[PDB]
Design a protein around this nucleic acid. Sequence first.
RNA 1: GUGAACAGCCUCUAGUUGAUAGAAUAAUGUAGAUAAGGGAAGUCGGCAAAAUAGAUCCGUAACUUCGGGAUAAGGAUUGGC
RNA 2: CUCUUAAGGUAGCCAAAUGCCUCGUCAUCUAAUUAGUGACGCGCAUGAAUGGAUUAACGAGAUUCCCACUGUCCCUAUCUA
RNA 3: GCAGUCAAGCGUUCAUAGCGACAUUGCUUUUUGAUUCUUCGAUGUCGGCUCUUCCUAUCAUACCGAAGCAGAAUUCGGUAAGCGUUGGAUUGUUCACCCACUAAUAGGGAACGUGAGCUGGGUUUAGACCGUCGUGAGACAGGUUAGUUUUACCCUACUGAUGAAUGUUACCGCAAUAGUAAUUGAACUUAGUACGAGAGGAACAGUUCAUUCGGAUAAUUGGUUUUUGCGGCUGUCUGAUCAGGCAUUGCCGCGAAGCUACCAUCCGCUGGAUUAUGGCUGAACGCCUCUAAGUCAGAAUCCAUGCUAGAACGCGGUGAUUUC
Lengths: 386, 52, 136
Amino acid sequence: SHRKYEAPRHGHLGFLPRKRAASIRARVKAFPKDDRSKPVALTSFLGYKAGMTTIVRDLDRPGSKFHKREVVEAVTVVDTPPVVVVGVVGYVETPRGLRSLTTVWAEHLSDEVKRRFYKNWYKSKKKAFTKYSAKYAQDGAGIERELARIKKYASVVRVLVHTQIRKTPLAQKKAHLAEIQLNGGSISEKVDWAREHFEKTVAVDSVFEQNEMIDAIAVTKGHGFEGVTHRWGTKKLPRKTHRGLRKVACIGAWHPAHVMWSVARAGQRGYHSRTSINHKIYRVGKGDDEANGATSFDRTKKTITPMGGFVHYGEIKNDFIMVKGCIPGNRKRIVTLRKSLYTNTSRKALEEVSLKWIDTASKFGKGRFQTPAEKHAFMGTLKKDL
Amino acid sequence: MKVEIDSFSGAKIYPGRGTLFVRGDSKIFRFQNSKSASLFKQRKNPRRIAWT
Amino acid sequence: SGNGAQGTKFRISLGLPVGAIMNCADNSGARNLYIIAVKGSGSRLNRLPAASLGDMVMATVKKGKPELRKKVMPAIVVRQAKSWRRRDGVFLYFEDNAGVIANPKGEMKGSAITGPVGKECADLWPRVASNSGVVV
RNA sequence: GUGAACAGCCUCUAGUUGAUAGAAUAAUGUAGAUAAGGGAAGUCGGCAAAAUAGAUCCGUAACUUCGGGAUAAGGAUUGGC
RNA sequence: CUCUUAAGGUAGCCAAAUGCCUCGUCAUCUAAUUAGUGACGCGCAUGAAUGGAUUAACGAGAUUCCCACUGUCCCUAUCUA
RNA sequence: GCAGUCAAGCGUUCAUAGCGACAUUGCUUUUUGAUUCUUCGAUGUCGGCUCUUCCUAUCAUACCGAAGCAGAAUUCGGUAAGCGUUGGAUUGUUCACCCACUAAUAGGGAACGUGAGCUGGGUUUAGACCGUCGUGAGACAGGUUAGUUUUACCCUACUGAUGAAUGUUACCGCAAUAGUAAUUGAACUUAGUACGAGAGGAACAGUUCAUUCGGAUAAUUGGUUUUUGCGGCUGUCUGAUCAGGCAUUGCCGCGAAGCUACCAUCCGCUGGAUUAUGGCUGAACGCCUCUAAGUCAGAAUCCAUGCUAGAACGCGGUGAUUUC
């Protein structure tokens, strides 16, 4: 009645309500400011988070105790095969908000995506875009018209792309489909680029580059129904308390005579949407490269995949993004990697990294070896073999 | 970047792995994991632990 | 850390909450240092203030020369048993907690330190570095 | 049988297998455990927990109604062959 | 020497489970003690089988500290039924 | 308790930098009284713990105007409640008092917030000792010790979770409304510089770190162990061996995975418009004047960007739409 001692409230009221996300694919809610002066290009990319490993590198940061010295950092690797372009959607400005006027799709869609439009594929007749396809029959018009409508009206333009989830260890056959804003220049140029890419493929190395700071958008890992203590970091009550002690003791004063939206309560924890910013690209992997995991210092032939394989994920056989630190969501989960809404100049953000070594030991226990070759060298001959 | 060796097991220690103890004299010890670390604490003898 | 310090100290894990008693590693005649405050340190309802390698603490001497007891003096933490992680990825730790009596400017009361002494402490405090034997 | 033992633990004779059941394994509980570093800073208060513990050999203060205090305290030892 | 009303607190003990003032004053223990202990005593209102003082042993009694111990706490996590 | 008006006086000189007597106008309702309106077929005391929110008479932090402002330090004052406001010793305490850290350790409200939320130390039943009082039974707003803390499954609120009906079903989207977040310190350098007789002694820009908070995450390190996963051990039972049972998970060492910790690591955006205030042009008033008209700069403020939900009676674009 004036709280005896003062403390900060538990938890952030800007991340309410703490409910399950609508979709498991978190929504890109903002794309970068468009600079229509430069080449048409994608502003985000879709991938699957595969696991984390460890890096070594010299730091470059004059004035730091750790300048010109080796530091060792957690990284996370996200499996990033090429994305296929299959549509363009045009948006108009209105006094009520951005609104979509049409979507024009590609003549041919793969099963991977088509499957996204069904709940019972095994037994459907797979009629998905079968009448739409015929719009291509006519030398162009129906399609060529709608393209023209987007050129004429339309204020922002997004492509529709999907993951090639089959190129990935996942059991799931259904691919993930998303709109991604086209930021390169000019509405007309945008739709042509889009037209030209229909059914074609786009790789990450045409979106993102080493040292870039990028944002990650993903639904957070679920945890089911949580109590107040772990959900909000409320303080345990004393051992002595009757009727349990993972609670908050006082849910409210007498007036307002209503439990209030700001007190902590049990309920869902996890499976929330997070846009996490400022994650520096430390590697852009090529899938064709059998030395993915190597360095100009660690010259050995090895791929990024850990001995044993990424736990609970499998192998990395495609292009990949390696990002410093960590990212929301869990292994297997779809992630959108978005580019920065701003021009960071951090010095931390401008630093150019070069890896020196990338861990590759088994993450399935205290792994002591990077490559099968190294293991055999150390152990010598066993009772299997030879 | 250097690979240290586990001073109980002779095991390769890559950067970040295990722990480093610094004794009273100042003899530095490095373990590759918490197993060698523990056997060291129990005053086990590497020469009698067969996997070393 | 404290004030008198030359430089900054990257965060190191806390091992010594107020009430902790550490070995006194100088030749001042104190045997213990008992920590009553940590010079660094901000506030959180119920959080005990706690020190770590290179922090200046305020202490009293529980065991040791009478002329040196029953009073608060600054000390500096030079070894901690609680493990901590360095920017180069190594998690290390010492075999005991140990400190050295100092004045508020960082000058050490004693003139020798017994045991090794972690670099982080050494870097923050020249006069300790000076009197140190092995460092890390 | 173990062991100092009518203890505890396992067994033979005899007797039971009866006290709604199925599927899950959220919160919060009730009962049972463990925790890096610190060590009572928690609290009206060490409440609750933890630590000690059998035996053999050594050793054992003040005080005292000379009976005690005293397993004071503090230590070494302990399997198998 | 005197008054009330018969006498006028001896031996002891004491801020005591009896002291208002009062968290008394001094000393001790602590970084710090309305706590503890040793002292002091014109003691509101200690005091002699309405028993006073001392006291070894004993105490699921009240109280203070120290070692050991520790999730009491810093600051919470995890597991079983 | 808090704030004014007058200005005799203080303030070397000087009423008003900072203060301010005699008097005098007020404000507040966390003081204490006064009252006795509600409740005596019941509204569960004090303190603490926990947690949310509000006030501003602002302690810190942002930007300013004053000074008996040289510098440093302070003090008065404005816009400010955006954001913090602590760790201990003694006491049941609120209060009080010391130690100690700190940017600072402001003051208050919400049935003197908060007991089907806890605790039960104090108060205030019945046991009991003492002192005072009383012939006594007993009494004491005196000391002392021991003294059972009940119920939610209903409504609502709050947290989260499904969901009928708008041809059907699916995919991609909009964004009204509501929420919203970051915080504070130090070091290097500026600089032993500006200022100063000296003693002393700043700041802006730039750099590296840290505090409090928040959101994730599990490479690593650490914790957990019915992986009853491998091994070791006691006692018994299966004639022995092999291999096993029982000992409420028998015990011990290691122990993958999962979970998880400022005990671990990563991440926490940038535009506008304003307040105070300082000014420009400028009358009123041929002078003057930041103000009347007009106008520049301007804060931890506000509004957007960004971030979280997405109206289950707000909406767009798109695919496929039944012969058995």
